[PDB]
Amino acid sequence: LDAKSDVTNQLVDFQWKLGMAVSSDTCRSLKYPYVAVMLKVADHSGQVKTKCFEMTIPQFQNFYRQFKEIAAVIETV
Amino acid sequence: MAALTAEHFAALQSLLKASSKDVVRQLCQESFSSSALGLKKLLDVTCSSLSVTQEEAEELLQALHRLTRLVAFRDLSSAEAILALFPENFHQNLKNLLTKIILEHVSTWRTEAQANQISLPRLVDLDWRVDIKTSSDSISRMAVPTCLLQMKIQEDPSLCGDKPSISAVTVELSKETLDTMLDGLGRIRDQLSAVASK
Amino acid sequence: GRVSFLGAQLPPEVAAMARLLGDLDRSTFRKLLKFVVSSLQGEDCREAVQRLGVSANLPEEQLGALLAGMHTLLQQALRLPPTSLKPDTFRDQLQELCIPQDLVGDLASVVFGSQRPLLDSVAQQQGAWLPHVADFRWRVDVAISTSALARSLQPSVLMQLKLSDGSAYRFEVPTAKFQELRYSVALVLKEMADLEKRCERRLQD
Amino acid sequence: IDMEWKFGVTSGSSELEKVGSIFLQLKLVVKKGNQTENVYIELTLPQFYSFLHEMERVRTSMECFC
Amino acid sequence: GKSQSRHSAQIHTPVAIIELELGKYGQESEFLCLEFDEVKVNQILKTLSEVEESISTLIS
Amino acid sequence: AALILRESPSMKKAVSLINAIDTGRFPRLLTRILQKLHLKAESSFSEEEEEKLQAAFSLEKQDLHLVLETISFILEQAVYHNVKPAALQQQLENIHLRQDKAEAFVNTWSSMGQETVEKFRQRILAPCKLETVGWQLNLQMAHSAQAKLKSPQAVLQLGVNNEDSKSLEKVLVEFSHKELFDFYNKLETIQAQLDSLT
Amino acid sequence: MLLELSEEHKEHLAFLPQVDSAVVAEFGRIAVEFLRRGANPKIYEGAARKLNVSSDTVQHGVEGLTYLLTESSKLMISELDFQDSVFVLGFSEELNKLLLQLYLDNRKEIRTILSELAPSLPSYHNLEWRLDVQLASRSLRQQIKPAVTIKLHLNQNGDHNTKVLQTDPATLLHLVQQLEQALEEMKTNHCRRVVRNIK
Amino acid sequence: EGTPLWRLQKLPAELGPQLLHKIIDGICGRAYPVYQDYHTVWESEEWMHVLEDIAKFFKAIVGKNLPDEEIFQQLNQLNSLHQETIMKCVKSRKDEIKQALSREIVAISSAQLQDFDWQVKLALSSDKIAALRMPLLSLHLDVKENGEVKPYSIEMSREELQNLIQSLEAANKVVLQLK
Amino acid sequence: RLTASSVGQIVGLCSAEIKQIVSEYAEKQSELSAEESP
């Protein structure tokens, strides 16, 4: 059980959802869009975790742009 | 439970009931390794074969384990040294048998003990993978060496609960830290060599 | 004009049982007494009791009271040593009123039988509050060099300890602290010997 | 970030009266995120020598490009 | 850009490292690290592109 | 390879800055450090103390902090090698240090040098240490399942300092006469082990 | 049993005999202060400033006197034994009387201070009980299941710990019956003999 | 290597519906088919693979709501009989798969509520007073967080219960119109 | 401190493995130092 390819983590699946918050106890017209993500990741033990977090539209587009730049840079060399 | 008393030795006047020495050697090699998992097999073997209760097995295990531990602790490599530990009236036809059994297999116990010494978690395996940092978010490009040392650790099951608790770690180094590491380790190696040659 | 070992005022459990066991035969009572004894060593014997109740057509409300009475009576009886409870006083307190004559023999046999050593041995094991030491292993080192010192040359001791609770502890122990621990242990041994001596001299007057 | 070591010799144990087993202890101050963690390890003589040789190899390979 | 390892003597395949700053309001932040190669990065880019398309088509 | 001093531009800047300050402010802090060089959580200089020292020097905290770090490193090297004061007097002056600094260094090194090495000699690296010992003696006379007892009993408390967590735990143990005698015999054996190093 | 003093500790008591009782009383007051309000070596600086007296030997003397007081109150030895013990120090009879009186007047407070050094064990603090009967659930609507709620408070090394429990009338009766037996042994011949012959 | 269902050919036409429908039942929340029923036809280490392949294929097909032909064409190279079994299985219990998928969407969060139970009681007397007569509602919750089920308990009186019901009804006035 | 005899006395134990390990490490130079530029 020793492999260089896996050092820290490697996500095995990627799921997401799109929804918007309509109302809240402190505000009846909250009404803002949001986007969530669920990551299940595997460590050296061979197990599978589950990490989920929520984002906004500007944060999501920043995420997408950064991954695009990463793809370009990795492709070039 | 007791010390090296007549209780143990007189209780040891029951070991001739076996016909084959293989059972004797199995008992010898499982009593020296006293533990909850390793004791239960002795309990089952004795109760099933010798048709005795639990006390006759437990006290006999106590005696045999204590004898093995004592001889390993003292490193009694001469048969006459073991002869000093017995009374005259205790069975000599069994005393000589025990002496020969102990003498034949001493090195196994002497060596296997050193692998069970208490200690901090011990390395068992490592791997490394040099990497180059071509680009990052805060800088478009570079070419910088980097190291990724990965290691394996085995901790005693007792100190963590019921788990084996074997963990893996990864540390990302740079040039200066590696240089300091190597200088210190080379200094230690030079000290060891000087001691050897002195 | 004596005080029974069962307390100044008889508990309701045993008092009620006195009327209940006046019609049961000897064999069923003996089986129940055997089951109660087997319970005192910590074994689970519920199913056999249920089978006995089913066989003998006994309401649970009466079987439970009978079992409680016997268990409490025997527990209070076994607290004292045989030196503090003679058979004479025993059956005299057991005085026939609401009592069979043929069961006290079984009571004496169970109390004064070959099972009494086992009951005392397990009973002795009930007097414990805090964990006991299960094992003790050590390792003495001799530090030759260190990062902060070219040559240390400081003896040290590594200690590991396990307890019946399942706790495992490992720690270092320098020499001075070890000497303190050894002196404390010796002092405790000496004071324990002093108490052992005083117990005989200060209570046999 | 930081490292420490201790090199010493064993002179006995619970089950062996006399033994001269050498050992080495390490402490690694690794920056586990915003917090800090310490990793304590023990090595034997051959393992320490192999570790030193592997670090020498890594130093050789880490200065190839520049 | 990977170079080599303990046993392997020559490697060129690149990787990407991303660390995520996650934390619920009023609590200490956690960090998550991940590894990637070309194929997985392409798959993640495709999934994010589908997310964007779904965002676009639901306005009308 | 063969250099007790790692001369570098940082040290050149350090000697350039240090050589200017007069002898009237050097010895106090330098002696204040030797008693606390065995700690790395912080120096002997609190926020207000370093503030007033900064006001006296009237430079940025960076400069005085770097100078203090360099002095601490020099002292750490000296205690690492256990050098005689003559070695200091000879070598520090070689790197363009004015004589007042050298005398302040050498006098302080002569003052409390062996105390520092003795302090380091008792340093420990493992994350757990035994710090305090306490015990209580009781006589048990009766309990639920028995009565008319005259049995002594003992309790020991062990102060284990969890230096990893900067916290202290306590272990509660209980003994009888036989168990305590066995423990005492084990400790005596350990003592006999420690007596081979005379 | 008797304070047969150690030679090295005695050497630290040489400062007081060369000092008048007027400052020995102040040193005893300082020992009481060190026990109660804590120790501050800055008081050595104050003493040097106000008396031009070396701090090291003053610290030695105060610590030695405090140690004597602590190990004298730690045993509750009678006054005659204390007088016999200090007869070897070559001290003035007035100073001996002052020491004996100072020790005498501050024994109970010291023993109150020392009792916090023993091993800390869980200890009872308070108990609260509530009675309730279950009437309905999500599966049964008409029920009668009486139970007794208990909140037990325990103190461990200076903290407050709470436990939430439950019990039934028969078990509560058994608990009371057993605990009544628990505090009935101390009125018996064995316990009386043990507690009387010892003191 | 073609559609993930390629590993299903080894199983004859007769034992298809049982495996498929029991797998769908396992997806919905019931038990999954056991090894000792079809062990002769597959190996465990690959039985797990085929199980996962079938489950994920069904989930994707139901979620994306493909038309008849595209589902039909993907199964062209299967057994002459398995194709109709698969299509009929999709046609029969598509709604259960959709319900399970919608439930799993709520799994995208820190914690989820699994189930609960409430008990009502009448407090009669306490150490403070012996005329209490306080009705108390006990609410038990089993909420799954991370990867474990954490139980919780809440004790409420009439006022707290009324306020909670009021807030939940305020939320329900939005939930009902959002549909 | 550990007296100079103890410094000498420590030799009586560790020489069992130091003698072999240092010699082998010098022999390990065949793969470490003797030939690394083939």
Side-chain angles (χ1 to χ4, degrees):
Chain A
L1 295 173
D2 171 27
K4 64 90 182 172
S5 284
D6 169 35
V7 185
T8 44
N9 289 310
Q10 186 165 13
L11 63 93
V12 302
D13 186 74
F14 184 82
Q15 314 295 0
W16 61 267
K17 65 177 286 186
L18 196 161
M20 65 187 289
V22 171
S23 292
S24 178
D25 53 340
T26 43
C27 178
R28 66 169 297 285
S29 87
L30 199 82
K31 217 158 286 188
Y32 65 91
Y34 77 91
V35 59
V37 166
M38 165 154 87
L39 263 69
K40 42 197 297 199
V41 59
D43 58 1
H44 203 136
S45 182
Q47 305 286 339
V48 160
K49 300 187 179 183
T50 308
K51 312 301 288 165
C52 295
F53 56 94
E54 191 194 307
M55 302 143 50
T56 50
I57 306 302
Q59 297 196 250
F60 173 80
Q61 50 203 32
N62 181 7
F63 203 46
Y64 191 32
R65 165 160 46 79
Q66 263 174 70
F67 263 70
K68 195 199 292 175
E69 297 282 1
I70 292 168
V73 173
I74 190 167
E75 191 279 321
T76 187
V77 65
Chain B
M1 284 73 74
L4 280 293
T5 71
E7 203 283 348
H8 292 171
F9 277 106
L12 293 174
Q13 294 213 0
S14 306
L15 279 295
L16 279 75
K17 166 200 284 201
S19 66
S20 170
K21 324 182 291 153
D22 53 37
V23 189
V24 166
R25 196 72 90 164
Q26 293 334 290
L27 268 74
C28 182
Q29 293 179 356
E30 65 183 1
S31 74
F32 158 67
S33 303
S34 193
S35 50
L37 278 61
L39 183 143
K40 183 175 174 66
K41 205 74 166 185
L42 182 90
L43 285 172
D44 298 349
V45 167
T46 286
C47 295
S48 177
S49 189
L50 302 180
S51 66
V52 288
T53 62
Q54 287 69 241
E55 281 63 36
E56 195 278 333
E58 182 65 26
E59 190 277 331
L60 274 291
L61 181 61
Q62 202 271 300
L64 202 64
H65 175 74
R66 206 71 78 176
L67 182 84
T68 49
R69 204 44 57 100
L70 181 76
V71 297
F73 195 95
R74 289 287 186 181
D75 187 32
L76 302 157
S77 51
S78 73
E80 49 262 32
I82 307 167
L83 176 144
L85 270 51
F86 290 73
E88 189 276 331
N89 64 7
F90 181 76
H91 291 185
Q92 309 292 292
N93 47 50
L94 179 62
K95 180 175 169 180
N96 61 0
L97 170 55
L98 290 179
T99 306
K100 55 181 84 156
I101 288 159
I102 297 169
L103 260 174
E104 289 310 272
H105 273 227
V106 70
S107 81
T108 310
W109 310 324
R110 279 279 300 189
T111 45
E112 194 160 316
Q114 292 182 21
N116 296 115
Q117 307 289 56
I118 57 165
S119 52
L120 321 184
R122 56 182 69 253
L123 186 80
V124 301
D125 191 340
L126 73 165
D127 197 3
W128 56 266
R129 167 169 79 72
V130 177
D131 193 8
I132 307 300
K133 320 174 77 170
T134 309
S135 311
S136 186
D137 50 356
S138 62
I139 176 162
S140 191
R141 63 179 222 266
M142 65 183 73
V144 179
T146 295
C147 173
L148 291 173
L149 166 72
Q150 179 160 35
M151 291 175 278
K152 203 165 186 168
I153 281 155
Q154 176 179 14
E155 168 61 275
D156 194 316
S158 189
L159 268 290
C160 59
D162 309 71
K163 319 172 288 191
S165 300
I166 290 186
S167 66
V169 300
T170 176
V171 296
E172 180 161 55
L173 276 68
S174 188
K175 63 192 83 179
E176 298 175 301
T177 315
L178 188 80
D179 282 353
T180 298
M181 191 146 288
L182 259 185
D183 185 74
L185 299 169
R187 174 151 69 191
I188 290 288
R189 183 260 313 292
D190 267 357
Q191 290 290 65
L192 197 159
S193 197
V195 168
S197 64
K198 189 259 283 183
Chain C
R2 289 181 61 86
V3 297
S4 86
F5 66 81
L6 207 47
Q9 57 187 1
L10 278 62
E13 280 153 279
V14 69
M17 179 253 278
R19 284 82 152 203
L20 277 296
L21 78 165
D23 292 331
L24 266 64
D25 72 281
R26 185 255 178 181
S27 195
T28 53
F29 166 98
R30 204 291 311 181
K31 293 182 89 168
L32 276 162
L33 188 153
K34 166 195 173 182
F35 284 170
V36 169
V37 166
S38 188
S39 188
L40 282 192
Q41 296 86 17
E43 292 81 2
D44 176 22
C45 64
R46 299 166 288 176
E47 295 312 296
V49 174
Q50 178 143 14
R51 294 172 211 156
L52 173 51
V54 172
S55 166
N57 204 297
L58 283 154
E60 300 95 20
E61 302 93 330
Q62 182 271 302
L63 198 72
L66 184 63
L67 291 155
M70 311 215 68
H71 166 76
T72 315
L73 164 64
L74 294 185
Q75 185 71 94
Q76 294 302 323
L78 287 167
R79 271 180 72 232
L80 315 160
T83 305
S84 298
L85 180 74
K86 305 311 305 183
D88 291 331
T89 49
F90 182 76
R91 325 153 301 270
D92 301 319
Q93 295 178 358
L94 294 174
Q95 213 69 221
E96 271 289 80
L97 280 64
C98 293
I99 301 299
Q101 263 277 356
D102 63 358
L103 295 175
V104 186
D106 274 330
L107 272 296
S109 66
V110 60
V111 170
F112 302 93
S114 194
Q115 292 75 31
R116 182 67 178 284
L118 169 72
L119 294 174
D120 271 349
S121 163
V122 65
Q124 284 161 359
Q125 293 167 263
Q126 283 216 348
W129 196 55
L130 279 159
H132 297 251
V133 166
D135 70 350
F136 194 53
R137 292 204 284 155
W138 71 85
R139 184 201 77 179
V140 302
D141 312 317
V142 179
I144 298 162
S145 304
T146 315
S147 177
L149 183 62
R151 302 207 322 244
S152 181
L153 273 291
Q154 186 75 309
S156 189
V157 174
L158 190 73
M159 206 169 282
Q160 170 149 325
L161 196 76
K162 195 190 281 179
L163 311 168
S164 299
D165 274 5
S167 309
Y169 298 108
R170 174 188 66 207
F171 48 85
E172 282 266 350
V173 60
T175 61
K177 205 43 80 193
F178 174 85
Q179 290 304 332
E180 199 163 300
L181 191 152
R182 182 169 165 234
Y183 181 76
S184 298
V185 170
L187 180 46
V188 175
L189 275 296
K190 174 182 90 143
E191 304 287 33
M192 288 174 90
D194 207 39
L195 292 175
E196 190 167 324
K197 275 174 186 62
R198 278 182 65 192
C199 293
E200 300 105 359
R201 296 295 86 193
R202 297 321 311 281
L203 300 173
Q204 293 288 278
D205 300 328
Chain D
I1 294 161
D2 175 337
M3 192 256 267
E4 293 179 353
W5 67 87
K6 150 166 151 185
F7 162 50
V9 161
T10 304
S11 67
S13 77
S14 54
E15 66 275 16
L16 307 183
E17 199 176 73
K18 268 278 180 183
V19 60
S21 56
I22 288 160
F23 71 101
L24 182 83
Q25 300 193 2
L26 301 166
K27 176 170 95 162
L28 303 157
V29 179
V30 67
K31 177 184 176 168
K32 277 221 170 192
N34 207 43
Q35 291 292 279
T36 288
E37 194 88 335
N38 290 318
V39 179
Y40 299 75
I41 319 179
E42 175 175 292
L43 306 183
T44 56
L45 215 51
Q47 293 173 278
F48 159 59
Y49 264 120
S50 72
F51 178 97
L52 197 151
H53 159 56
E54 282 286 10
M55 295 298 102
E56 285 206 277
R57 265 194 63 207
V58 162
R59 194 251 310 290
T60 51
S61 171
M62 195 172 139
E63 67 194 342
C64 176
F65 184 90
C66 72
Chain E
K2 298 185 280 188
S3 185
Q4 53 172 124
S5 77
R6 192 214 190 102
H7 289 293
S8 184
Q10 173 36 41
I11 313 185
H12 184 83
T13 61
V15 287
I17 316 296
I18 69 178
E19 182 145 340
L20 278 296
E21 301 188 15
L22 306 171
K24 287 180 281 181
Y25 194 12
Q27 298 177 22
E28 56 172 326
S29 293
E30 67 185 291
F31 296 89
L32 183 63
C33 177
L34 308 161
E35 292 179 351
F36 293 108
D37 62 358
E38 291 286 80
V39 184
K40 207 171 281 290
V41 171
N42 271 274
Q43 295 295 323
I44 286 167
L45 194 82
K46 181 60 59 166
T47 307
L48 299 167
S49 313
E50 301 322 321
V51 175
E52 185 192 19
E53 183 71 351
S54 296
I55 286 156
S56 314
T57 307
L58 294 174
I59 62 170
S60 306
Chain F
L3 286 174
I4 318 185
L5 294 174
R6 178 211 67 164
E7 65 183 1
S8 302
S10 301
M11 293 180 183
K12 194 182 305 272
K13 177 263 288 180
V15 297
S16 180
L17 188 153
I18 297 169
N19 289 330
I21 295 149
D22 200 359
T23 314
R25 265 151 279 125
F26 208 78
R28 312 176 304 197
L29 63 95
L30 192 143
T31 301
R32 194 187 258 163
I33 291 298
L34 65 85
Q35 182 188 349
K36 295 178 67 157
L37 178 56
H38 187 273
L39 278 154
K40 274 292 281 303
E42 66 183 1
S43 78
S44 197
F45 308 145
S46 45
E47 208 66 25
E48 287 187 352
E49 189 62 38
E50 73 198 331
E51 279 164 45
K52 58 184 76 179
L53 188 153
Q54 188 274 330
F57 290 166
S58 66
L59 266 75
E60 317 321 321
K61 293 182 183 293
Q62 193 199 42
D63 283 19
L64 55 78
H65 183 177
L66 276 172
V67 170
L68 290 160
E69 190 281 328
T70 58
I71 307 145
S72 179
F73 179 69
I74 295 282
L75 294 174
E76 192 255 2
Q77 283 276 2
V79 66
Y80 180 97
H81 291 312
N82 290 318
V83 298
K84 193 170 82 73
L88 307 167
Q89 295 203 129
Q90 294 297 109
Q91 190 175 4
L92 300 81
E93 66 178 279
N94 294 6
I95 308 299
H96 316 91
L97 283 88
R98 210 160 314 266
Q99 205 78 332
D100 61 329
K101 316 315 195 306
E103 301 311 344
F105 268 101
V106 72
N107 284 276
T108 45
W109 173 233
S110 62
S111 78
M112 311 295 188
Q114 307 298 357
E115 284 89 343
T116 312
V117 68
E118 193 71 1
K119 196 178 178 189
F120 269 98
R121 189 188 311 289
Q122 298 265 22
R123 184 191 269 298
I124 301 288
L125 189 73
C128 291
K129 276 185 296 314
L130 198 147
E131 207 69 72
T132 58
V133 166
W135 57 277
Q136 175 177 66
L137 175 53
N138 291 355
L139 200 153
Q140 186 170 247
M141 41 175 78
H143 55 94
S144 293
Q146 196 148 44
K148 217 153 185 157
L149 293 171
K150 304 172 301 273
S151 73
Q153 268 203 354
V155 178
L156 273 79
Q157 180 181 270
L158 305 175
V160 181
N161 175 17
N162 289 327
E163 188 266 332
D164 52 344
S165 172
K166 294 162 41 183
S167 54
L168 182 145
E169 78 191 74
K170 300 179 185 191
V171 184
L172 290 162
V173 191
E174 188 156 67
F175 275 88
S176 176
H177 202 293
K178 193 153 154 58
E179 297 164 88
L180 212 58
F181 191 68
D182 298 328
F183 207 77
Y184 172 71
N185 261 325
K186 283 177 198 165
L187 294 176
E188 285 294 314
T189 293
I190 284 171
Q191 184 68 64
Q193 273 190 357
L194 268 167
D195 291 331
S196 167
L197 277 47
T198 59
Chain G
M1 185 64 72
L2 188 63
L3 275 173
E4 301 192 34
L5 302 93
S6 174
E7 44 264 30
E8 314 170 7
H9 167 232
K10 175 181 174 183
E11 300 287 53
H12 294 87
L13 273 294
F15 182 76
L16 278 296
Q18 292 180 74
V19 166
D20 61 355
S21 54
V23 186
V24 179
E26 173 53 25
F27 274 139
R29 279 172 201 101
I30 287 157
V32 176
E33 291 161 357
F34 274 20
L35 281 293
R36 297 179 71 185
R37 282 85 169 92
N40 204 323
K42 176 180 47 51
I43 283 282
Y44 308 158
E45 282 194 24
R49 288 170 169 171
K50 201 147 61 186
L51 306 166
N52 277 26
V53 298
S54 74
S55 286
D56 179 80
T57 300
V58 167
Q59 170 263 354
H60 285 315
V62 298
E63 71 171 17
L65 200 77
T66 301
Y67 192 74
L68 175 60
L69 271 73
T70 48
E71 319 187 290
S72 49
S73 304
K74 173 166 92 187
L75 288 92
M76 195 65 72
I77 53 156
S78 64
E79 305 97 323
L80 189 71
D81 287 357
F82 197 112
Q83 190 80 332
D84 178 17
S85 82
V86 296
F87 214 80
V88 193
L89 314 191
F91 284 22
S92 161
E93 311 315 300
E94 313 306 340
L95 199 60
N96 276 16
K97 180 179 76 81
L98 180 65
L99 287 191
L100 194 151
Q101 185 57 18
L102 209 64
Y103 161 45
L104 211 62
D105 313 318
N106 221 322
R107 274 188 297 90
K108 83 194 289 170
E109 187 177 359
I110 292 291
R111 272 176 66 85
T112 296
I113 295 297
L114 294 169
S115 179
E116 285 68 6
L117 277 154
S120 43
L121 282 48
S123 194
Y124 164 89
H125 178 58
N126 194 21
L127 162 56
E128 312 192 89
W129 65 269
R130 180 194 74 186
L131 186 143
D132 63 358
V133 304
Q134 186 186 130
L135 293 177
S137 170
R138 202 184 174 196
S139 73
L140 264 166
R141 282 288 146 101
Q142 273 153 70
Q143 291 188 144
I144 312 288
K145 313 192 79 167
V148 160
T149 309
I150 288 158
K151 179 138 189 154
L152 183 65
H153 293 267
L154 313 164
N155 278 3
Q156 312 184 4
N157 196 357
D159 63 358
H160 307 284
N161 198 282
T162 80
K163 310 291 196 185
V164 304
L165 308 167
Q166 174 191 103
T167 188
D168 56 309
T171 299
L172 185 65
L173 268 295
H174 184 67
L175 294 189
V176 174
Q177 184 202 110
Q178 271 287 327
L179 287 176
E180 269 186 323
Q181 296 184 359
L183 53 79
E184 204 272 328
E185 299 217 80
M186 294 299 291
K187 304 147 197 164
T188 74
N189 267 34
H190 197 59
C191 281
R192 290 165 169 274
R193 275 200 308 165
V194 174
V195 70
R196 180 176 57 250
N197 273 279
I198 295 296
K199 186 68 73 66
Chain H
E1 192 145 30
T3 192
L5 279 76
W6 73 267
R7 219 179 302 280
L8 190 64
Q9 282 295 121
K10 308 183 192 169
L11 187 153
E14 54 160 306
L15 304 202
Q18 298 208 332
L19 178 87
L20 284 163
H21 281 293
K22 192 69 84 197
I23 289 164
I24 303 307
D25 291 331
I27 287 171
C28 302
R30 274 91 71 191
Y32 274 107
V34 65
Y35 195 19
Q36 288 290 10
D37 207 289
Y38 314 121
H39 80 276
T40 59
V41 189
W42 281 300
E43 183 77 335
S44 73
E45 279 71 348
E46 272 286 343
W47 179 41
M48 311 205 98
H49 275 298
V50 65
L51 192 53
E52 183 178 1
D53 273 298
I54 297 169
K56 67 203 297 178
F57 170 74
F58 270 111
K59 285 175 196 167
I61 289 289
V62 172
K64 304 303 177 66
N65 200 35
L66 275 68
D68 203 358
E69 203 294 328
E70 183 178 1
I71 307 179
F72 208 74
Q73 80 97 24
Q74 286 180 354
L75 317 172
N76 54 3
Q77 216 272 330
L78 309 198
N79 194 317
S80 168
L81 194 148
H82 286 188
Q83 306 152 28
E84 281 325 319
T85 309
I86 297 281
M87 302 277 318
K88 290 218 280 195
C89 168
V90 162
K91 264 185 282 173
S92 77
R93 61 206 316 195
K94 194 164 54 48
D95 209 289
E96 279 74 73
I97 297 147
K98 195 189 200 265
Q99 287 171 30
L101 290 165
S102 179
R103 190 255 296 286
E104 161 75 340
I105 279 164
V106 179
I108 299 164
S109 287
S110 293
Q112 317 90 18
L113 184 75
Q114 283 266 291
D115 62 358
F116 64 97
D117 190 20
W118 55 268
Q119 312 176 331
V120 170
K121 42 183 81 181
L122 173 69
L124 293 172
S125 51
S126 83
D127 50 328
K128 299 294 188 279
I129 59 172
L132 184 42
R133 277 93 159 90
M134 208 185 193
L136 298 165
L137 172 72
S138 171
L139 191 70
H140 291 321
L141 301 165
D142 273 308
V143 66
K144 188 168 194 168
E145 61 206 330
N146 288 328
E148 55 160 49
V149 181
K150 202 46 171 44
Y152 285 104
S153 63
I154 311 185
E155 183 149 46
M156 318 155 74
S157 188
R158 288 170 61 171
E159 284 80 40
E160 297 95 2
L161 181 59
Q162 214 291 336
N163 197 16
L164 174 54
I165 285 170
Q166 188 185 20
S167 296
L168 298 186
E169 209 287 330
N172 201 9
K173 177 54 171 170
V174 181
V175 160
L176 212 59
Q177 88 188 3
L178 261 183
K179 309 173 90 71
Chain I
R1 309 159 173 185
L2 276 181
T3 316
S5 182
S6 304
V7 184
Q9 197 161 3
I10 206 170
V11 172
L13 288 166
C14 50
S15 295
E17 197 62 16
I18 297 169
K19 196 200 301 181
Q20 311 321 97
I21 206 72
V22 179
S23 60
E24 167 57 16
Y25 190 68
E27 293 179 353
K28 286 266 186 284
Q29 284 195 351
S30 67
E31 71 196 30
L32 264 72
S33 179
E35 190 175 337
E36 274 291 358
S37 187

